[PDB]
Design a protein around this ligand. Structure first.
Ligand SMILES: CCNC(=O)c1ccccc1Br
Lengths: 237, 300
């Protein structure tokens, strides 16, 4: 059923699974028109489909042309997400297809179930977890590729960089969620933390800086503080 | 006007005949029901005084044979049977009528309730849903499960209603996933009406028979089927005008007839609120919406 605090280690077992987050698929800027009314302008979006055991991220870029001439875009966005996830699954060899897909928002359940009717043995699950994947567009290299896209495109990344050479997938996921939660709470502060020391760089083929083990401990501490303070900065404690 | 004689009444029982019902005491000199209108199906149903568990009964049409009821002390229930000897049967009935040992089907002349609840219900279709081909009448009880309930366990004793499943390949055309799920017209008109039922009369007949089994026996799978067949229409943007008008009348009489005190278990809040207030047909069921709002405004 639903994935929650009690069945957390299931994410790092050897059954292939994917998280799907649709919060960045349909993105708009809201603005005034010459007549003083309000309109929206769409901007490029993305589906965030992540294997939490390996770090493989299938980033399907959603170009604004997909919305042209369509109505009820926030409803369409869920079905488009389900269509693209289904297409990804069909594109993978049988032995790479997931056994479960976990959607971060419950409104994705019926769209995905209907698009996956051909795969009766792939379980579609919700989660009670407050997963921070909306903050993926605060990762500079991810935001850059989404905004530059001029057509539909899938781009593959490992969201863990090379961390799995040194740490387990449980620990890598915990670091990822702490970083992403930090970026969601105060993006400026979080980004200041990550880049303050110019001698630690981001490799061309990575998303995050090349911290030593000891430097990740300090970084992780700084991110908890940022969120620790921000659990009062708005909520006064 | 036809008659269903009873050999006797050895156990105390509430007997129903269509929407009517009367109590018979243990060993009371009761010998059946006369003046049954010809031209409709009918249901004769039972609830024992000592075990209200298991309401059960028989669907029948007196044009198809001479039927009577006889209690079986081994299986412990009132059983319907056919008498093939027509002269023996006429003789029995005439004796019981002369001794005035039969209740009269108590139809008020102004009253079209039974017709309105069974307009599209045919015995031939009942017998395909309830499979027992050696008999011309059909037994149903509170506990019998439906084919679809079994899929999710004895098949000979099942209600073979047409399976409806909105998240199924039958319901969803490849490449029309969002379209077919949010507007079920394809599934209603092509798959179900043109393909399976053939015409709307047979669809309405199964819908009416499911409601009646839900109401008279508390059969949960029948209630599920009734609501699914309503929801499939209401969730279709394109429905023939005559079908919507007839559906409004069908549901009006069903809601009118439902016992006020059974609404909590026989009416699904989600389906009805969706059908009357959100669906494509939210404005096409005026009669049904008015009776629902005046009789069960809590549910809504
Ligand atoms: C802004 C303060 N933090 C939060 O609101 C929050 C929300 C969801 C999950 C974790 C946190 Br720490």
């Amino acid at each position: 059923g639903a994935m929650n605090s009690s069945n957390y280690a299931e994410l790092f077992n050897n059954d292939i699974k994917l998280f799907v987050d649709d919060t960045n698929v349909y993105r708009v800027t809201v603005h005034k028109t010459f007549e003083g009314n309000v309109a929206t302008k769409a901007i490029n979006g993305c589906i965030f489909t992540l294997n939490p055991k390996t770090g493989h991220l299938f980033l399907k870029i959603i170009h604004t042309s997909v919305w042209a001439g369509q109505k009820r875009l926030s409803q369409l966005a869920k079905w488009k997400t389900a269509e693209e996830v289904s297409a990804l699954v069909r594109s993978l060899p049988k032995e790479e297809q997931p056994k479960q897909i976990i959607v971060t928002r419950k409104a994705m359940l019926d769209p995905l179930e209907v698009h996956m009717l051909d795969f009766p043995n792939i379980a579609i699950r919700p989660t009670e977890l407050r997963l921070p994947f909306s903050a993926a567009m605060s990762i500079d290299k991810l935001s850059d590729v989404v905004m530059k896209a001029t057509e539909p495109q899938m781009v593959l990344f490992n969201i863990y960089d090379d961390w799995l050479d040194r740490i387990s997938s449980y620990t890598a996921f915990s670091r990822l969620t702490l970083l992403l939660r930090a970026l969601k709470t105060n993006e400026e502060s979080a980004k200041m933390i990550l880049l303050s020391d110019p001698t630690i760089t981001i490799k061309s083929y990575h998303l995050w800086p090349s911290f030593t083990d000891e430097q990740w401990i300090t970084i992780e501490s700084q991110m908890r503080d940022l969120i620790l303070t921000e659990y009062g900065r708005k909520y006064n404690v | 006007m036809n008659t269903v004689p009873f050999t006797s009444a050895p156990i105390e029982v509430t007997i129903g005949i269509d929407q009517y019902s009367f109590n018979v005491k243990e060993n009371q000199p009761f010998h059946g029901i006369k003046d049954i209108p010809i031209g409709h199906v009918h249901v004769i149903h039972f609830q024992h005084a000592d075990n209200s568990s298991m309401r059960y009964g028989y669907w029948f049409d007196c044009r198809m044979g001479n039927f009577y009821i006889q209690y079986d002390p081994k299986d412990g229930l009132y059983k319907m049977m056919e008498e093939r000897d027509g002269a023996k049967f006429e003789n029995i009935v005439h004796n019981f009528k002369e001794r005035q040992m039969m209740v009269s089907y108590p139809k008020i002349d102004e009253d079209d309730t039974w017709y309105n609840l069974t307009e599209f219900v045919q015995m031939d279709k009942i017998r395909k849903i309830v499979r027992k081909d050696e008999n011309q009448f059909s037994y149903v009880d509170s506990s019998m499960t439906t084919v679809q309930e079994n899929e999710l366990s004895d098949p000979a004793h099942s209600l073979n209603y047409t399976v409806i499943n909105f998240k199924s390949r039958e319901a969803i055309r490849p490449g029309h996933e969002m379209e077919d799920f949010l507007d079920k017209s394809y599934y209603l008109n092509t798959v179900m009406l043109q393909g399976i039922f053939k015409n709307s009369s047979n669809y309405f007949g199964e819908l009416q028979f499911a409601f009646l089994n839900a109401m008279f026996f508390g059969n949960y799978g029948s209630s599920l089927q009734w609501h699914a067949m309503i929801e499939l229409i209401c969730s279709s943007a394109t429905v023939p005008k005559h079908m919507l008008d007839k559906l409004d009348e069908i549901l009006y009489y069903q809601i009118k007839t439902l016992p006020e005190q059974y609404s909590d278990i026989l009416l699904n809040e989600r389906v009805w609120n969706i059908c009357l207030y959100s669906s494509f047909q939210k404005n096409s069921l005026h009669n049904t919406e008015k009776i629902m709002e005046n009789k069960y405004p809590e549910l809504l």
